[PDB]
Design a protein around this ligand. Sequence first.
Ligand SMILES: [Ca+2]
Ligand SMILES: [Ca+2]
Ligand SMILES: [Ca+2]
Ligand SMILES: [Ca+2]
Ligand SMILES: [Ca+2]
Ligand SMILES: [Ca+2]
Ligand SMILES: [Ca+2]
Ligand SMILES: [Ca+2]
Ligand SMILES: [Ca+2]
Ligand SMILES: [Ca+2]
Lengths: 662, 662
Amino acid sequence: LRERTVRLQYGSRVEAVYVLGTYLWTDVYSAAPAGAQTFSLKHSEHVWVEVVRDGEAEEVATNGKQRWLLSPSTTLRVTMSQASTEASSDKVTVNYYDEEGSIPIDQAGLFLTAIEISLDVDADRDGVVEKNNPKKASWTWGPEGQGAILLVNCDRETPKEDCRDEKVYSKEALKDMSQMILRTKGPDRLPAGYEIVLYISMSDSDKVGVFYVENPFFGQRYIHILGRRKLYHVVKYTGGSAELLFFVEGLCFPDEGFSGLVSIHVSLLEYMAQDIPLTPIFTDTVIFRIAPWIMTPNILPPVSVFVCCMKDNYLFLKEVKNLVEKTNCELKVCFLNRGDRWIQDEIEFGYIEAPHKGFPVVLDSPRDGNLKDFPVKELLGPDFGYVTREPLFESVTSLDSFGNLEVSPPVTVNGKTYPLGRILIGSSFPLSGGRRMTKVVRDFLKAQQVQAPVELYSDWLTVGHVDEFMSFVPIPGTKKFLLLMASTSACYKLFREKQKDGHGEAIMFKGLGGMSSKRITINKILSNESLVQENLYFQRCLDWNRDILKKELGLTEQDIIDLPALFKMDEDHRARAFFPNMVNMIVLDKDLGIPKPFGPQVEEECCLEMHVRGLLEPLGLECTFIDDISAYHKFLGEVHCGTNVRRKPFTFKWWHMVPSRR
Amino acid sequence: LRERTVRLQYGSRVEAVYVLGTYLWTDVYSAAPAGAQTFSLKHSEHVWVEVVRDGEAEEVATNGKQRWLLSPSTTLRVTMSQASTEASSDKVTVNYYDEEGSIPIDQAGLFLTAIEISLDVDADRDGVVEKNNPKKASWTWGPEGQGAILLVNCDRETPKEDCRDEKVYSKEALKDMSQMILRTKGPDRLPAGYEIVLYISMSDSDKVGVFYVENPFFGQRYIHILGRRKLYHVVKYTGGSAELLFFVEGLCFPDEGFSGLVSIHVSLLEYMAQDIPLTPIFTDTVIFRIAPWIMTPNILPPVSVFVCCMKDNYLFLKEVKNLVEKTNCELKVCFLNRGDRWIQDEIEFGYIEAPHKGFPVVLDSPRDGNLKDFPVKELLGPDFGYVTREPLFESVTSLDSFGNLEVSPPVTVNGKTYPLGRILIGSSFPLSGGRRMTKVVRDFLKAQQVQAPVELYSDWLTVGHVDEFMSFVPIPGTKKFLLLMASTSACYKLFREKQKDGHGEAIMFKGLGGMSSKRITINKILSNESLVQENLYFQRCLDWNRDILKKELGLTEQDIIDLPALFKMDEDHRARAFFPNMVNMIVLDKDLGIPKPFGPQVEEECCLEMHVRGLLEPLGLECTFIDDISAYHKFLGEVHCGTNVRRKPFTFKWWHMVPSRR
Ligand SMILES: [Ca+2]
Ligand SMILES: [Ca+2]
Ligand SMILES: [Ca+2]
Ligand SMILES: [Ca+2]
Ligand SMILES: [Ca+2]
Ligand SMILES: [Ca+2]
Ligand SMILES: [Ca+2]
Ligand SMILES: [Ca+2]
Ligand SMILES: [Ca+2]
Ligand SMILES: [Ca+2]
């Protein structure tokens, strides 16, 4: 399909390599002796030759005596369909004649060696490397889209991430890598003056690495041939039909300034002379897209439940164990220097996938320098990946914690489907001068593209995390889900009812000895005027979020349930929980671990517990209240335990999505 | 279409601004007294009220006596279709009842002021600002695409570019600017606690500026309200139906890291209390795309012919004048410190366009520090723009000159149309370690996107410019064009013919006295063996380019004519012209100014001139040979004159293109 110029040379024979999949146009006029009138040609059996006059092509016999007028506009088109062997003589010979006489006055010739060269990848995304996919040089989204996929190699095979260096050790490691095969066919050797070279751009050199596995005498060997500080590698040619197998790894996720696309080239180079660069004769290119980091909403099947707490919080552990035992999930428990909530706050479970393989990958929250410096690498291991983003000049705040990072179930909004859901992060109003998650992390999340992030307003909360006020739960037995929203108005309605009912003296925080002297009742709560005003204002903040969520997630009031909540304002005019926030809950399918609220007791049951059950249970959701605060004897608005659930990936393949143009 | 949450408040009246184009969902349950069973409602004539039970909505009369059960899932939907006036009382009142008795036990109410707020731009690209285009918040390419366009204001109204500062002076200046109108409708004033604010992001603040024109007592006044170091502006509200007219300017072209898209917002803000940020109640957004810098191929109608030479090169000036007099073009002549070719090398004429206006814009080549430091601003003026890109850490080379920057005619390649043609720039092979145009300039050209740049191989030439070896010409009387390629093989064929004909002693450079002692003939040229080998190699370089051009421009051999050329190799193994390169020519439609070659004289005519005429004239192209070298008495491979043609823009609108996803 590609036409290449090869001219005959005046008086001299021309030798050239012909690469299958191309064809030659050949000027015979320049090589004609002065005074020459006509020309004739001969060619071998495996070379097809057409005489082309002003676009009109005529195929010519191997030995014709046919003669044509010499003209600038009369040329040859030369095609070969099969590679040369050692038995080949592939040639075209042109004879020139003058006016008088039929014996040639000169001859010019073209001697050819045909070879096949193809750099192949699995562009059709079935896990196997197909021969020369015509689409391998581009990358397109969607069910009909094409082009190869590369995984960041962020995990660790042998006890930093595998991609932090240029070395490969074990065979298992190669499984994380995408295969790329250089397929060639030809005679025993390349003709003099040619070589085959693999290469990448300087820019891509920190995005990829390429290894070749050789099996020498003493064992299998993995050579790093392209990557950081290696931009090119000269390939050893072997004749006949040969394949060279390479393994490719990504070193970097998509990010600000990096689309995720990288390229690898192979060229056939021709030696000209000393001090003169080699001419690329033929170049073949493949494109990879590096797979994005993807999060998991609460609707996806749970795999493992991770929790952190102090060794002596017994009730919490017994109750979490009890909950998980109702499911098929496994429980993992940890008791680190600091960060009581760290499992929830310092890490987010996500995954990467390619047609041939995938695995969970953990994102690590930025280090402030006050509490967190040490990264959490304790979870870095085989087929568990690690990644992080550290701000250069920007200060870290509470909004950088991953309690502030969540993701919605799959949604359709204005007719646009988001099959992986949408990432949600808390922020402050634009003109507010308030807190915001660091740009480096926001940029990262935006760059993954397939979760199309949305900013909510969390800055009205002292801690500032979206998970304080909202969560999602599946509706059992269906494909649907609900948004759960904290509501102060719901709490006040409930307490006002219980007061009307004669329960005004009902006490909260029963069993927390450090709260006893405060003697906090429903009456005491309802009679506090400033607290009412604080909570009206917090309800306005919640409702502003409700409106953003309904708009950006395509939700109606039918999709939302309000859970009673209550806050107290701090000196910064931000909210901290008055009693534990029930909305932040462990969701394992139909089973919900719900923080125990310690609300007013009516007839020896917590009226907050009974109210939540009455909302959820009719939907087939099973509620277990989990007490994380008793071991501390009081609740000041902070929770000292954390949980994070690792989930199965979406069955929808990310590469089948079609994100909006950026 | 947008639903907003507004709750009734327990015991107290709620006052709210309602923005047309939204509607409210209203919880009446929270505000109900404890023990209340049912509710009823009244509403004014301009407020529509529906009672919504589990998604089922029923419209309700202005005064009904109807009563409904109080439930969390029974709410109101409140709609208004027209703005409030001073005669309006727009309200909804809800009465609550207990079990026993029909007299209300309490009342909660909602008092509304409806206003219209719309930030409007010409998104449909007709030059007029339409009312609230539903597509104004996005930007799409193509004939069906939508969203507003902004021009970089790079020219200068009053004798640096207008965008270099925050000031506006004259009314003519506003014509370069896109109009944006804030349209409002409402009562005499906003209710207490509200204000309207225009704003942009910190990131966009160096991409745009926004002015308001006020007409105070002593004259018209232009206030810069958004831009560098102003991120927001509080708008003065006026009642009734009002429009505020703003003018928007772009400060920056698309580039590496900047897509060309910017946003402007207006919000209605609500005051909460001291130390508490204002709540955006409603926000409306418009998007602008900044128009790309676009070049002009030789096929476009010429407007002005710019030339630079020394005052005494008389023949050049007479001959260029003669040529231009055959056309409708105007001639502009300049005689600067240095850069004899500067008009060709230091500047490129291009243009920008928006639906309401456009104008030529000059790009200025990077300063090296050896020859060029001073930018060329002499051409900066009204409706002639200026732009430049300076490398930070990168060294400038000859490939940064704009002799190395050209553009193809409109082409179709593999079925993909490039209606504006494709930009061409010379480079070196990837593995060569050779010269390349600076990244900053390459990045700029790539960022414009609509000319989809292609790199050719110019580094085999000492000067290193694509315009040394190739050019395009229209085919008169048709819509087609030809690629012209320098060819050494064509030159050797021609000289070998003339030698055979008995002309071997024909002398070149006739009339250049400084060349006389060299006595260079056809025989002398043909007998130089090393020169033959040099030129075979240069023909290989030309042919490598021929192949790239045919592939990337979708050209066949029918589209190409070869012009005889000859080079001499320098100590770096690069080519310099042996006789003037004829391919670099002034193209004014059918009339071609061609550098006079000073070739061997046969029968008192230059055989190179006669040969070129024989190729071109049959196509209806008229050739004028222009002598730029006689004033210098010799030709060493450098030309001391320059020309650049300013052309009419393409009739195809750039915004009707659909570029590939990046
Ligand atoms: Ca495949
Ligand atoms: Ca490694
Ligand atoms: Ca690995
Ligand atoms: Ca692995
Ligand atoms: Ca999280
Ligand atoms: Ca319009
Ligand atoms: Ca200005
Ligand atoms: Ca201007
Ligand atoms: Ca102007
Ligand atoms: Ca140019």
